[PDB]
Amino acid sequence: MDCSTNISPKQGLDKAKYFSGKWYVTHFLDKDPQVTDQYCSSFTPRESDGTVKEALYHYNANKKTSFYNIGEGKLESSGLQYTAKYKTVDKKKAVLKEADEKNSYTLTVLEADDSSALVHICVREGSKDLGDVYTVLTHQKDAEPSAKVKSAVTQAGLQLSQFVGTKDLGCQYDDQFTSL
């Protein structure tokens, strides 16, 4: 299901609150009703002199499999957003497959504070949208998002009641992969 094109980042957001620690997805919204598998995800995003690089993990809770990626792209000047190319790696961060140059994801930060964040991700394989997802993020696994971030969900035109909560899925994480 094609990504929403009604996305732009929150202006004036504090990038130091976003590029910090690791994030766990506590709640995700993929509106596509053809989806069946539910995921857990965690990642650790960094930024140095305009270049964003992040280590990313997905766990397919239905199939009990996982995959790892490294994303890299430029920080937009117009707001807290980046379009990254991604490599596939193993749990030891060894490269399995270099980036396919036709593929990218755009991550747009909608809110970020010291405990929590809200972001939108659209993954593209050339001219095909793989899909988009909104993710509520916290620094501690199974934590509660802040009131500020909950407000951002509503103000994005969304309803938290429709998100899938990950705390009850039986997630397996790889905390070593996302550690400082």
- Residue ranges in contact with ligand HEM by CB under 6 A: 25, 28, 30, 39, 41, 43, 56, 58, 69, 86, 88, 105, 107, 121, 123, 130, 133, 135
Instruction: Supply the minimum distance, in Å, between the C-beta of residue 48 and ligand HEM.
Output: 17
With respect to ligand HEM, which residue has the nearer C-beta, 28 or 177?
28
What's the closest the beta carbon of residue 9 comes to ligand HEM, in angstroms? 14
**Residue number with CB closer to ligand HEM (18 or 105):** 105
| Binding-site residue ranges | 58
Annotated binding site for heme: 58
For the chain, give the secondary structure using H, E and C. Answer: CCCCCCCCCCCCCCHHHHCCCCEEEEEEECCCCCCCCCEEEEEEEEEECCEEEEEEEEEECCCCEEEEEEEEEEECCCCCEEEEEEEEECCCCCEEECCCCCEEEEEEEEEECCCEEEEEEEEEECCEEEEEEEEEEECCCCCCCCHHHHHHHHHCCCCHHHCEECCCCCCCCCHHHHCC
How far apart are CB 157 and ligand HEM at their closest, in Å? 19
